Amino acid sequence: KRHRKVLRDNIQGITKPAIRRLARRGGVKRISGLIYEETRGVLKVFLENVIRDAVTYTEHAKRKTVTAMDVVYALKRQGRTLYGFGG
Amino acid sequence: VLRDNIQGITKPAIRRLARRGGVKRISGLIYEETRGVLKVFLENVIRDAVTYTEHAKRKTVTAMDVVYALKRQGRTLYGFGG
Amino acid sequence: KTRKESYAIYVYKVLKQVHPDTGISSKAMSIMNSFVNDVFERIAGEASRLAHYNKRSTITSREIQTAVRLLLPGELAKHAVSEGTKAVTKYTSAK
Amino acid sequence: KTRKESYAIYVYKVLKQVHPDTGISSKAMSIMNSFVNDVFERIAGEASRLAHYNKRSTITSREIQTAVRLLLPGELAKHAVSEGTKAVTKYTSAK
Amino acid sequence: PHRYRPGTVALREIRRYQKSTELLIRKLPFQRLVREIAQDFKTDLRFQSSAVMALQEASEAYLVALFEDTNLCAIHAKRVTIMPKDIQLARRIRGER
Amino acid sequence: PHRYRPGTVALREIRRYQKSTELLIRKLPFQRLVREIAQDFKTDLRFQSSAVMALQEASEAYLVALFEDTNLCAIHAKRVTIMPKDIQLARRIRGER
Amino acid sequence: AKTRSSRAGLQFPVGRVHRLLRKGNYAERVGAGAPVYLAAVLEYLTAEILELAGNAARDNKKTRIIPRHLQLAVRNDEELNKLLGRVTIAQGGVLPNIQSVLLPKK
Amino acid sequence: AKTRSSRAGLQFPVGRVHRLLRKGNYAERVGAGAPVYLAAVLEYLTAEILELAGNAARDNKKTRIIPRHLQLAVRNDEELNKLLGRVTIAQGGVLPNIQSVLLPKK
DNA sequence: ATCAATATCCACCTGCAGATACTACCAAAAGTGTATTTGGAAACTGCTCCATCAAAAGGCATGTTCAGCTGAATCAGCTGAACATGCCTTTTGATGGAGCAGTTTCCAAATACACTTTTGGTAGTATCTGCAGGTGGATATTGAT
DNA sequence: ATCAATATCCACCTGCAGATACTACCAAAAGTGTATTTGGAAACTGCTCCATCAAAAGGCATGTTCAGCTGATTCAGCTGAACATGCCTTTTGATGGAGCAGTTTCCAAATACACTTTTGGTAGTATCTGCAGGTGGATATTGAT
Ligand SMILES: [Mg+2]
Q: Which chains touch C (3 or more CB pairs under 8 A)?
A: A, B, G, H
Position G97: which residue type? Answer: N
Q: What is the CATH number of domain G1-106?
A: 1.10.20.10
Q: Which of H72, H67, D41 is closest to B71 using CA atoms? A: D41
Check CB contact under 8 Å for C80 and G44. Answer: yes
**What residues does E82 pair with on adjacent strands?**
B26
**Residue B78 φ then ψ, to 5°:** -110, 145
Q: Which helix (H) or strand (E) holds D83?
A: helix D74-92
- Contact list in D for residue B81 (CB cut-off 8 A) is 30, 34
Q: For residue F39, say whether its CB is under 7 Å from any atom of strand J.
A: no
Residue nearest to nucleotide J83 (CA to C1'): E3
In chain D, residues 18-57 whose CB comes closer than 8 Å to chain A: 46, 49-50, 53-54
Residue nearest to nucleotide J123 (CA to C1'): C1
HEC secondary structure over B19-47:
HHCCCCEECCCHHHHHHHHHHHHHHHHHH
**Residue H7 φ then ψ, to 5°:** -60, -40
- Name the burial class of residue E94, with classes exposed (0-12), middle (13-18) and buried (19+) by CB atoms within 10 angstroms of its CB: middle
Write the CA distances from A3 to A6, A45, F31, integer angstroms: 10, 29, 19
**Looking at CA atoms only, how far is residue B77 from chain H in angstroms?**
5
**What residues does F46 pair with on adjacent strands?**
A65
> Does residue B56 belong to the interface with chain C, where contact is any CB pair within 8 Å?
yes
What is the rounded (10 degree) CA torsion for G87, G88, G89, G92? 130
**What residues does A82 pair with on adjacent strands?**
G88
CATH superfamily of E1-97: Histone, subunit A (1.10.20.10)
Residue F18, helix vs strand vs coil: helix
Write the CA distances from G84 to A26, C72, D68, G93, integer angstroms: 19, 10, 28, 15
What's the CA–C1' distance between C18 and I17, in Å?
27
Radius of gyration of chain E (CA): 17
What's the CA–C1' distance between F19 and I74, in Å?
40
The per-residue DSSP string of H20-57 comes to HHHTTTS-SEE-SSHHHHHHHHHHHHHHHHHHHHHHHH
Domains and CATH numbers, chain C: 1-95 (1.10.20.10)
- Contact list in D for residue H15 (CB cut-off 8 A) is none
Beta pairing class for H64-65 and A65-66: unpaired
Domain span at residue B34? 1-82
Distance F37 CA to ligand 1 centre (A): 7
The residue among F15, F21, F50 with the most chain G CBs within 10 A of its CB, best to mutate, is F21
* Alpha carbons G13 and D92: distance in angstroms, whole number: 47
Handedness of CA E65, E68, E70, E76 (dihedral sign): negative
CB atoms within 10 A of CB A58: 26
Assess contact for G49 and G83: CB atoms under 8 A.
no
Tell me the resolution in Å: 2.4
G55: left (phi over 0), alpha (psi -120 to 50) or beta: alpha
Number of domains in chain A: 1
Assess contact for A39 and F62: CB atoms under 8 A.
no
* Alpha carbons C61 and G41: distance in angstroms, whole number: 11
Give the CATH number, domain containing residue A60: 1.10.20.10
Strands (E), chain D: 23-24, 58-59
